[PDB]
Amino acid sequence: SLGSDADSAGSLIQPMQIPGIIMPGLRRLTIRDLLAQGRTSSNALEYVREEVFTNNADVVAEKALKPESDITFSKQTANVKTIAHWVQASRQVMDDAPMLQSYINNRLMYGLALKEEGQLLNGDGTGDNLEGLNKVATAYDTSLNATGDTRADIIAHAIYQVTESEFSASGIVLNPRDWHNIALLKDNEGRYIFGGPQAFTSNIMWGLPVVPTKAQAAGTFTVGGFDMASQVWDRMDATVEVSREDRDNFVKNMLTILCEERLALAHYRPTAIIKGTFSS
Amino acid sequence: SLGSDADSAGSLIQPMQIPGIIMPGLRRLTIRDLLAQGRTSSNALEYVREEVFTNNADVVAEKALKPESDITFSKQTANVKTIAHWVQASRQVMDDAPMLQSYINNRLMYGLALKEEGQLLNGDGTGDNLEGLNKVATAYDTSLNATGDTRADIIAHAIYQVTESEFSASGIVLNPRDWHNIALLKDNEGRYIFGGPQAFTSNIMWGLPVVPTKAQAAGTFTVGGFDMASQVWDRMDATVEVSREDRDNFVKNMLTILCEERLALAHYRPTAIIKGTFSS
Amino acid sequence: QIPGIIMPGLRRLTIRDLLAQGRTSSNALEYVREEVFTNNADVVAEKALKPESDITFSKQTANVKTIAHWVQASRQVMDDAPMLQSYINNRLMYGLALKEEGQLLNGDGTGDNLEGLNKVATAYDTSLNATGDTRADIIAHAIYQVTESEFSASGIVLNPRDWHNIALLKDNEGRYIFGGPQAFTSNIMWGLPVVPTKAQAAGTFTVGGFDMASQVWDRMDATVEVSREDRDNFVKNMLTILCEERLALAHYRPTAIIKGTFSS
Amino acid sequence: SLGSDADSAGSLIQPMQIPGIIMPGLRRLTIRDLLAQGRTSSNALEYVREEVFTNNADVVAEKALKPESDITFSKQTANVKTIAHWVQASRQVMDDAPMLQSYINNRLMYGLALKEEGQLLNGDGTGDNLEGLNKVATAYDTSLNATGDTRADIIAHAIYQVTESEFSASGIVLNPRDWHNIALLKDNEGRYIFGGPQAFTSNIMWGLPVVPTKAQAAGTFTVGGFDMASQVWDRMDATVEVSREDRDNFVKNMLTILCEERLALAHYRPTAIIKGTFSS
Amino acid sequence: SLGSDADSAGSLIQPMQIPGIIMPGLRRLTIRDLLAQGRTSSNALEYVREEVFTNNADVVAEKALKPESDITFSKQTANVKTIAHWVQASRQVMDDAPMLQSYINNRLMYGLALKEEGQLLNGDGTGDNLEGLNKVATAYDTSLNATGDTRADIIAHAIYQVTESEFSASGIVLNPRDWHNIALLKDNEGRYIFGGPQAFTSNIMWGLPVVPTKAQAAGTFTVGGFDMASQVWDRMDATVEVSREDRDNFVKNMLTILCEERLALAHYRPTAIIKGTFSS
Amino acid sequence: SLGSDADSAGSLIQPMQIPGIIMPGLRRLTIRDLLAQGRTSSNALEYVREEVFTNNADVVAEKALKPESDITFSKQTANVKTIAHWVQASRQVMDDAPMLQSYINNRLMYGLALKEEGQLLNGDGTGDNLEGLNKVATAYDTSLNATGDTRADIIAHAIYQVTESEFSASGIVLNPRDWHNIALLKDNEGRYIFGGPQAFTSNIMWGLPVVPTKAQAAGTFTVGGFDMASQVWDRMDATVEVSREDRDNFVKNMLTILCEERLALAHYRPTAIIKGTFSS
Amino acid sequence: GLRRLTIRDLLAQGRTSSNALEYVREEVFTNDITFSKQTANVKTIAHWVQASRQVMDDAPMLQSYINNRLMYGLALKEEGQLLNGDGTGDNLEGLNKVATAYDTSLNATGDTRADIIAHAIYQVTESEFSASGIVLNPRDWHNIALLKDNEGRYIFGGPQAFTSNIMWGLPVVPTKAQAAGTFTVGGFDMASQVWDRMDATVEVSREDRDNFVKNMLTILCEERLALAHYRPTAIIKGTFSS
């Protein structure tokens, strides 16, 4: 018997190579698009806002001393932080596999821009980390919660809390799973609130566009008027340059690929942003 | 070692200035826009309003004596009150910051019109205060309430009470939060009474425009024929004047900015204005 | 003073509009109506005597009554305050026209009072009321009783208070019957116009074929006149305002009108 | 005192005369138009219809005797009856009131046609009365009544019973009283199946036009293909003749007015007509 | 008195003759038109269908025994039957009434077509009776019945069972009464399933045309792809012959009329036809 | 009696032959068409996917050493399997029935392609059986099931679990039996979710096309982005060959018919497919 | 043409064309000084007189005669609205109502009735204004002109060198409108003035309350004006104590 088994004549048939590398899931990047985009050539930014307006205007009696009003200001600052990462690779692998070069590039760029979004949303603000939308955002007012509200009502409430500062909301950001359970709400009869089984509902509720992103922690939601509340400032766009003289590199026949970027997130009106937690 | 911190050469980098200033929530002005506007030039305005119409009109026999019916109106007097406030600023600041004054002006005019709207609505009527719509307003008829009424039913009821004087209601005044908890009403089966999760409903109720102003207290509501029943009289339009010779300003390099305005509120048909409290 | 008067676009659906409007120029009016038609038309046996039918008539009359009222104010206030001059005038018109309906709908018929609708109107059928009916459900019943005269109903008269709570009826589900809060309900019921009048007592309702069952005859339109020299007036330097009007309500078909009580 | 009553100058003013007369509620004639209007010139009519069709068609075994079928017929008869009435009035009245002549005519016609319709529907059949639809019609099948049926359901059932004769229905006949209580039907929620206090529903039910007439008894109802199940034969149209020489009318200065008519109702297919009672 | 009674001058007026004979209800034939109309010339027919397809195709290991699959067939038969009936009439009557001849013919055809349709649907399939649709039809699946199913749900289920043969359904056969009680179905709320009382619903259900025939027994329903699941073969078209010399007809002065037909019903796919009982 | 009986002269009549063999229900192939198609000419296949991407891109402090990220890769293989079956027929039947082979050919292909589809779905993976979608597919998340969910909700949940791979779904595989009970769902009122009895709902759910196939086990469902999750590689198309000398076929006077095919199923993204079970 | 000074002449006379007015008041001053602002309605005054057309048509000379007899009859009533004007309904803002009371602390034990008047003239200066005239009751003014001492000599002065109506060099208006035992003094010339909206005109009407049927004719002298008070301090009213 002459089979294709390993311990036989199966050594003459070479498996067909399928051209192309299989990348994982590429998350549809958002947030950075929700915010305004500007450019700078400095290392930091300074803007001014009205801090405290002491309005004492009132009715005045004839021949009497009038009320003295006062106004306070502040110098708000936004430092430029640097985000990046490098990869050390063997010169062999890079030469034996040509396509690899341009592959790593298109990967680090994504990997970078991913943490970029990850910062803008949940920035620790701890020294180097950017002050993300959530660390800034004004907490949701629990007092708005009425008896017997659905998770949908809560968002509706949040949207209003933005108006409580005379500002129109831009969009709604929630974890994909939450948005799911929400779109699948039913009434005391059984009908679907957003859309019968016929077709899935559009990513829109209460007149505002919904943005489901895995970048948003589960059970957490952020509503606000991003289009006119915060702005991203680019000092240096995401660039990728390679060098094989970096330290040991030349003597070890190595190759170092770098992918850096410089940002700065500014939060003009923090009152126009709201963060909260759903009730489990 | 050559960083950007204080210790090192960070002094060379000057943060980028953000052209412009950040004004807080600019509330949308209303109320006075609902009322009739007129110009005057007197210290006050003696007027009269129909108090009691004793209608005795009836079928008269031939060669008989006709019925005598009289109209008894009280002589009320709308005094011209003055609203204003001033700001004592440093002259150094005013010269160093060019467009600063231009800002303060458009800022005081706002603070003025804001406390103005606050009067026209909740005018105490005592002393220097005006006789606000809610003071003049005829109390709500509690007997109109029936078993199992919604907050929406109540407003509908009020609209009718406005007809008791025979005058089409101009609009509905409510606290933004109350209006909210109303738009989000559901039927005993679940379905949304106004717009459903698909889209937010417009600010209209029972064909009448709804006015949600933070000026209106929580739990309080007002319905009536504003565009007909009451009129505002502008003695002196809102204006701003500056003087550095005021008091000891010239001697201290100070600048006194004054923002004043003279008003006068009249109430021709008080029977056409309803006020009430949401029992919860 | 602002030129011209502020004409309201608030047609409260004048109760008069619901009726035929004709003009006269005499003391009163005389129409003829068929009283009793003794219909004996039946099947006839051959070579036998036939049924004798008979018809009865009547000369029904409708007198012209006068309605008015007057006021007396100081002239130093009238000729001195022109825009107020026309104000009192326009108010007396409203005051008069308001009592006008008061008669047309609830006329005593005795003495000088006109023979109002409710007086003539055929009583409502207490039997039409079924177990568990809404208030608007009853009005529907009335519309039918009007058909007992072979006449299409024309309008519905109700007290604003009652009518109000009518438009706010709800089903066991929760939704409104006449219109979702999004827009105000127009004064219509079962295709018939509705007239909210304070003149109509609460708990009372009137339905019928007004379009052609009763007619209003105007002898004299509502006019306003003044007298500089009436009795005292000249001395007291005053003025007497007068708002008069001459009407006449005729009732052609009494069976075409219904009056009832909202037993609830 | 110069009044306007009897004891004064009231005889001078003549009341205004209203043109013509006020005819009572002219009922709308319908039944006559629901049937086939044929013309005759005889004393009676003879039509032949198949009675019993003993159909014994079956499957026959080979070389076996076949089934014998039989047919039966009958000669049905429709007599011509006469309807009329007269009214003798004073010669004076006629000459003094010209408008009267033409009036009396129009009244005697409506009066006759009224009793005409009253025959076609509920014709006794005995004596000289016609055999009205109701006395001919096949009784409603009580078996068709299911637990929890509305009056509207029953009518729907009747419409089917007509089909049990292989004939399509034409219309529905009901007493306005009963028809009324039908249009006002509500579901378990409270909504009107026809109206919904916005507009009165049209006279159409189950695709078939509804005919409400006082001619129909209270509680009684008729359904069928009238325009094909029966036919009206006119020997003499409704004519009005006047005689001044009738008996002693010449000597009493009188004048007699006659209004006669000759009819004949034929019932071709009685199976295509149904009558019943609303037990409740 | 010269009246028109029998015992008087009434013997002079001849009743008007109504041209034509009144035929009873004419049932609309359907069953026959639902199938394929092919014609033969023999006393029987033979079609072949795949009986059991034992498909054992599976995944086979390298250098291993592959699976064996077997197929089975069968010869299905279809005998032709004869339907007919005769009428023995008087030779005299036939001459005195000419139109009778043509009438009897048209009445014998219908009389035959009835028991024809009656066979095609409920053919006993015994000795001489054809193998009717209901005898062949695969019994309904009693498992498809779920908790709280309307009578309408059942037919919906039946339609699916037809698909279990990978064949589309053609129509639905129901007894007029059952179809009736179905169109009048209501929901737990009280509303009408098919159509509001404003208009009678069309004869369609689940997209498939409905066929109400009195031939279909009460409480019995049939669904399938009749358009190509079975077909009728005409050996001899229905014809009418007459004999004067038949038996003692020449002596008794009679006339015998015959109306016969030769049909053959074939059932190709029984899996595409379903019969069931409305349990209630 | 000279009839058509068997024992009589009924031997001269030959039953009419109906051409064409009656094939059973042809199951519409689907699973095959869902997956992307391509072909090879090798014994096996090899694709590479990104295994573990260690993303450490964090905020870096000034003058401090940055983070090190790593990327791991893996070589995934896909073996080629063979599917076939043979039929041992008789030479007698073959020569006496010409169109038989032509039939068996167009019959074994379907029989084989039936198992092909049966493999692609429920591929065991063990031994020579292919690693079908159901085996590879990431198990359904029991956690997503909430209290008060219908079978329709579960599928909706699954569609989301697919999104956890950043890939959108493209189809829903269900057993026709189950898909039926789903389309016939009702609410508390009683109304149908997908469509009133007036018409049958199209094969769509939540905007995604539904694929009902008997190849899918009862109570099992599969959802994912098949058009970009897996690919079918054909080594050899379905071919049919016959042998007269196979084994003792020459002596036994037999004929063997073979039908084979070579497949290869690759599963690039297993996370984009889901298998579940209904607990009820 | 009655040769007598009128209260109307005492005040400044101007014209106007409005419903009412806006004027500024000069406030107090008592043991510094101040200012304010007030209003002035234009009210009408007149008195009807009806006779007969049989007399009026038979005498053209009598026509103009009555016109003059009423012009005078009006002034006497006009004088009442100016002086004791109630200032309520259709009455003008009167002087006696707005006038500052007399200072009793200015009376010396042993003086005359006229001395009191002189004291009042002084209070006029205590408002930074010059006096204008005196308004008295005819009967009162009469007793004043006829005064003598304990011996017999004339207090005021003999008829010898007598003239018209003056006192301390000021115009005197003896009006019946002034109460019996009351007086008024002020700087009318520059203090409070009257604005004439419509002069005294006369019209007639045959058709009236009755007239047309009684053949009577009604005559009327209508005149509407406005009275403003700039300095209420410049005027003093006092009770003649006796």
mmCIF file with all atom_site columns, N, CA, C and O in Angstrom, chain F residues 157-181:
data_model
loop_
_atom_site.group_PDB
_atom_site.id
_atom_site.type_symbol
_atom_site.label_atom_id
_atom_site.label_alt_id
_atom_site.label_comp_id
_atom_site.label_asym_id
_atom_site.label_entity_id
_atom_site.label_seq_id
_atom_site.pdbx_PDB_ins_code
_atom_site.Cartn_x
_atom_site.Cartn_y
_atom_site.Cartn_z
_atom_site.occupancy
_atom_site.B_iso_or_equiv
_atom_site.pdbx_formal_charge
_atom_site.auth_seq_id
_atom_site.auth_comp_id
_atom_site.auth_asym_id
_atom_site.auth_atom_id
_atom_site.pdbx_PDB_model_num
ATOM 1   N N  . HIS F 1 157 ? -29.977 37.367 19.843 1.00 0.00 ? 157 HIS F N  1
ATOM 2   C CA . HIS F 1 157 ? -28.834 37.387 20.752 1.00 0.00 ? 157 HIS F CA 1
ATOM 3   C C  . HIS F 1 157 ? -27.601 36.857 20.027 1.00 0.00 ? 157 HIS F C  1
ATOM 4   O O  . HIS F 1 157 ? -26.526 37.450 20.102 1.00 0.00 ? 157 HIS F O  1
ATOM 5   N N  . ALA F 1 158 ? -27.776 35.737 19.328 1.00 0.00 ? 158 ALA F N  1
ATOM 6   C CA . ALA F 1 158 ? -26.700 35.097 18.578 1.00 0.00 ? 158 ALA F CA 1
ATOM 7   C C  . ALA F 1 158 ? -26.067 36.054 17.574 1.00 0.00 ? 158 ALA F C  1
ATOM 8   O O  . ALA F 1 158 ? -24.842 36.110 17.454 1.00 0.00 ? 158 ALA F O  1
ATOM 9   N N  . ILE F 1 159 ? -26.906 36.810 16.869 1.00 0.00 ? 159 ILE F N  1
ATOM 10  C CA . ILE F 1 159 ? -26.437 37.778 15.880 1.00 0.00 ? 159 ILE F CA 1
ATOM 11  C C  . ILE F 1 159 ? -25.441 38.748 16.515 1.00 0.00 ? 159 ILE F C  1
ATOM 12  O O  . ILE F 1 159 ? -24.484 39.181 15.870 1.00 0.00 ? 159 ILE F O  1
ATOM 13  N N  . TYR F 1 160 ? -25.673 39.081 17.785 1.00 0.00 ? 160 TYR F N  1
ATOM 14  C CA . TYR F 1 160 ? -24.787 39.979 18.517 1.00 0.00 ? 160 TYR F CA 1
ATOM 15  C C  . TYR F 1 160 ? -23.465 39.295 18.852 1.00 0.00 ? 160 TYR F C  1
ATOM 16  O O  . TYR F 1 160 ? -22.400 39.891 18.704 1.00 0.00 ? 160 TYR F O  1
ATOM 17  N N  . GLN F 1 161 ? -23.539 38.057 19.341 1.00 0.00 ? 161 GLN F N  1
ATOM 18  C CA . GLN F 1 161 ? -22.343 37.303 19.704 1.00 0.00 ? 161 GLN F CA 1
ATOM 19  C C  . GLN F 1 161 ? -21.372 37.204 18.524 1.00 0.00 ? 161 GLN F C  1
ATOM 20  O O  . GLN F 1 161 ? -20.170 37.003 18.714 1.00 0.00 ? 161 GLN F O  1
ATOM 21  N N  . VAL F 1 162 ? -21.898 37.365 17.313 1.00 0.00 ? 162 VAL F N  1
ATOM 22  C CA . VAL F 1 162 ? -21.092 37.336 16.097 1.00 0.00 ? 162 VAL F CA 1
ATOM 23  C C  . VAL F 1 162 ? -20.303 38.641 16.024 1.00 0.00 ? 162 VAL F C  1
ATOM 24  O O  . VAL F 1 162 ? -19.145 38.661 15.606 1.00 0.00 ? 162 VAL F O  1
ATOM 25  N N  . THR F 1 163 ? -20.941 39.728 16.458 1.00 0.00 ? 163 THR F N  1
ATOM 26  C CA . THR F 1 163 ? -20.340 41.059 16.457 1.00 0.00 ? 163 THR F CA 1
ATOM 27  C C  . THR F 1 163 ? -19.136 41.151 17.403 1.00 0.00 ? 163 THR F C  1
ATOM 28  O O  . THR F 1 163 ? -18.322 42.071 17.290 1.00 0.00 ? 163 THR F O  1
ATOM 29  N N  . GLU F 1 164 ? -19.023 40.201 18.331 1.00 0.00 ? 164 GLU F N  1
ATOM 30  C CA . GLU F 1 164 ? -17.906 40.187 19.273 1.00 0.00 ? 164 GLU F CA 1
ATOM 31  C C  . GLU F 1 164 ? -16.580 39.869 18.579 1.00 0.00 ? 164 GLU F C  1
ATOM 32  O O  . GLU F 1 164 ? -15.523 39.839 19.215 1.00 0.00 ? 164 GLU F O  1
ATOM 33  N N  . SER F 1 165 ? -16.649 39.633 17.272 1.00 0.00 ? 165 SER F N  1
ATOM 34  C CA . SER F 1 165 ? -15.474 39.341 16.463 1.00 0.00 ? 165 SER F CA 1
ATOM 35  C C  . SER F 1 165 ? -15.260 40.487 15.471 1.00 0.00 ? 165 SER F C  1
ATOM 36  O O  . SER F 1 165 ? -14.396 40.407 14.596 1.00 0.00 ? 165 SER F O  1
ATOM 37  N N  . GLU F 1 166 ? -16.052 41.549 15.630 1.00 0.00 ? 166 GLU F N  1
ATOM 38  C CA . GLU F 1 166 ? -16.003 42.729 14.768 1.00 0.00 ? 166 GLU F CA 1
ATOM 39  C C  . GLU F 1 166 ? -16.470 42.429 13.343 1.00 0.00 ? 166 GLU F C  1
ATOM 40  O O  . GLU F 1 166 ? -16.226 43.209 12.421 1.00 0.00 ? 166 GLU F O  1
ATOM 41  N N  . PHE F 1 167 ? -17.161 41.302 13.182 1.00 0.00 ? 167 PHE F N  1
ATOM 42  C CA . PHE F 1 167 ? -17.679 40.891 11.881 1.00 0.00 ? 167 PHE F CA 1
ATOM 43  C C  . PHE F 1 167 ? -19.195 40.765 11.898 1.00 0.00 ? 167 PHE F C  1
ATOM 44  O O  . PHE F 1 167 ? -19.778 40.212 12.830 1.00 0.00 ? 167 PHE F O  1
ATOM 45  N N  . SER F 1 168 ? -19.830 41.309 10.862 1.00 0.00 ? 168 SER F N  1
ATOM 46  C CA . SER F 1 168 ? -21.278 41.267 10.732 1.00 0.00 ? 168 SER F CA 1
ATOM 47  C C  . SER F 1 168 ? -21.753 39.925 10.183 1.00 0.00 ? 168 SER F C  1
ATOM 48  O O  . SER F 1 168 ? -21.075 39.308 9.356  1.00 0.00 ? 168 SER F O  1
ATOM 49  N N  . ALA F 1 169 ? -22.912 39.477 10.655 1.00 0.00 ? 169 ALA F N  1
ATOM 50  C CA . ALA F 1 169 ? -23.490 38.211 10.211 1.00 0.00 ? 169 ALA F CA 1
ATOM 51  C C  . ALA F 1 169 ? -24.048 38.347 8.796  1.00 0.00 ? 169 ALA F C  1
ATOM 52  O O  . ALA F 1 169 ? -24.167 39.458 8.273  1.00 0.00 ? 169 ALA F O  1
ATOM 53  N N  . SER F 1 170 ? -24.400 37.222 8.182  1.00 0.00 ? 170 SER F N  1
ATOM 54  C CA . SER F 1 170 ? -24.930 37.230 6.822  1.00 0.00 ? 170 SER F CA 1
ATOM 55  C C  . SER F 1 170 ? -26.039 36.210 6.582  1.00 0.00 ? 170 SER F C  1
ATOM 56  O O  . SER F 1 170 ? -26.658 36.204 5.515  1.00 0.00 ? 170 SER F O  1
ATOM 57  N N  . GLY F 1 171 ? -26.298 35.357 7.570  1.00 0.00 ? 171 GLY F N  1
ATOM 58  C CA . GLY F 1 171 ? -27.334 34.350 7.414  1.00 0.00 ? 171 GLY F CA 1
ATOM 59  C C  . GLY F 1 171 ? -27.699 33.612 8.687  1.00 0.00 ? 171 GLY F C  1
ATOM 60  O O  . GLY F 1 171 ? -26.912 33.553 9.632  1.00 0.00 ? 171 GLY F O  1
ATOM 61  N N  . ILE F 1 172 ? -28.903 33.050 8.702  1.00 0.00 ? 172 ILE F N  1
ATOM 62  C CA . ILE F 1 172 ? -29.407 32.299 9.849  1.00 0.00 ? 172 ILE F CA 1
ATOM 63  C C  . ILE F 1 172 ? -29.880 30.923 9.382  1.00 0.00 ? 172 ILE F C  1
ATOM 64  O O  . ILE F 1 172 ? -30.806 30.820 8.581  1.00 0.00 ? 172 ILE F O  1
ATOM 65  N N  . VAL F 1 173 ? -29.233 29.874 9.881  1.00 0.00 ? 173 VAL F N  1
ATOM 66  C CA . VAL F 1 173 ? -29.588 28.503 9.516  1.00 0.00 ? 173 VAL F CA 1
ATOM 67  C C  . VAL F 1 173 ? -30.498 27.880 10.573 1.00 0.00 ? 173 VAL F C  1
ATOM 68  O O  . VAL F 1 173 ? -30.141 27.808 11.750 1.00 0.00 ? 173 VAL F O  1
ATOM 69  N N  . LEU F 1 174 ? -31.673 27.430 10.140 1.00 0.00 ? 174 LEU F N  1
ATOM 70  C CA . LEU F 1 174 ? -32.652 26.823 11.038 1.00 0.00 ? 174 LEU F CA 1
ATOM 71  C C  . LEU F 1 174 ? -33.358 25.639 10.386 1.00 0.00 ? 174 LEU F C  1
ATOM 72  O O  . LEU F 1 174 ? -33.426 25.542 9.161  1.00 0.00 ? 174 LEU F O  1
ATOM 73  N N  . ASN F 1 175 ? -33.879 24.742 11.217 1.00 0.00 ? 175 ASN F N  1
ATOM 74  C CA . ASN F 1 175 ? -34.623 23.586 10.736 1.00 0.00 ? 175 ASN F CA 1
ATOM 75  C C  . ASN F 1 175 ? -36.008 24.132 10.396 1.00 0.00 ? 175 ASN F C  1
ATOM 76  O O  . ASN F 1 175 ? -36.605 24.849 11.199 1.00 0.00 ? 175 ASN F O  1
ATOM 77  N N  . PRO F 1 176 ? -36.525 23.823 9.192  1.00 0.00 ? 176 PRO F N  1
ATOM 78  C CA . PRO F 1 176 ? -37.844 24.283 8.736  1.00 0.00 ? 176 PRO F CA 1
ATOM 79  C C  . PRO F 1 176 ? -38.935 24.140 9.796  1.00 0.00 ? 176 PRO F C  1
ATOM 80  O O  . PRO F 1 176 ? -39.812 24.998 9.913  1.00 0.00 ? 176 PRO F O  1
ATOM 81  N N  . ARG F 1 177 ? -38.868 23.056 10.565 1.00 0.00 ? 177 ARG F N  1
ATOM 82  C CA . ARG F 1 177 ? -39.821 22.780 11.639 1.00 0.00 ? 177 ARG F CA 1
ATOM 83  C C  . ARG F 1 177 ? -39.811 23.905 12.671 1.00 0.00 ? 177 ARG F C  1
ATOM 84  O O  . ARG F 1 177 ? -40.865 24.371 13.108 1.00 0.00 ? 177 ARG F O  1
ATOM 85  N N  . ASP F 1 178 ? -38.611 24.332 13.057 1.00 0.00 ? 178 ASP F N  1
ATOM 86  C CA . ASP F 1 178 ? -38.432 25.398 14.039 1.00 0.00 ? 178 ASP F CA 1
ATOM 87  C C  . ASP F 1 178 ? -38.749 26.772 13.457 1.00 0.00 ? 178 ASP F C  1
ATOM 88  O O  . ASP F 1 178 ? -39.439 27.571 14.091 1.00 0.00 ? 178 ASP F O  1
ATOM 89  N N  . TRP F 1 179 ? -38.242 27.039 12.254 1.00 0.00 ? 179 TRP F N  1
ATOM 90  C CA . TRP F 1 179 ? -38.477 28.311 11.569 1.00 0.00 ? 179 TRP F CA 1
ATOM 91  C C  . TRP F 1 179 ? -39.975 28.579 11.445 1.00 0.00 ? 179 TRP F C  1
ATOM 92  O O  . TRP F 1 179 ? -40.415 29.730 11.454 1.00 0.00 ? 179 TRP F O  1
ATOM 93  N N  . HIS F 1 180 ? -40.750 27.503 11.354 1.00 0.00 ? 180 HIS F N  1
ATOM 94  C CA . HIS F 1 180 ? -42.198 27.597 11.235 1.00 0.00 ? 180 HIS F CA 1
ATOM 95  C C  . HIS F 1 180 ? -42.813 28.153 12.518 1.00 0.00 ? 180 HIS F C  1
ATOM 96  O O  . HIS F 1 180 ? -43.507 29.171 12.487 1.00 0.00 ? 180 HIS F O  1
ATOM 97  N N  . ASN F 1 181 ? -42.542 27.488 13.637 1.00 0.00 ? 181 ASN F N  1
ATOM 98  C CA . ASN F 1 181 ? -43.057 27.903 14.944 1.00 0.00 ? 181 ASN F CA 1
ATOM 99  C C  . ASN F 1 181 ? -42.632 29.326 15.310 1.00 0.00 ? 181 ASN F C  1
ATOM 100 O O  . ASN F 1 181 ? -43.281 29.982 16.129 1.00 0.00 ? 181 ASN F O  1
#
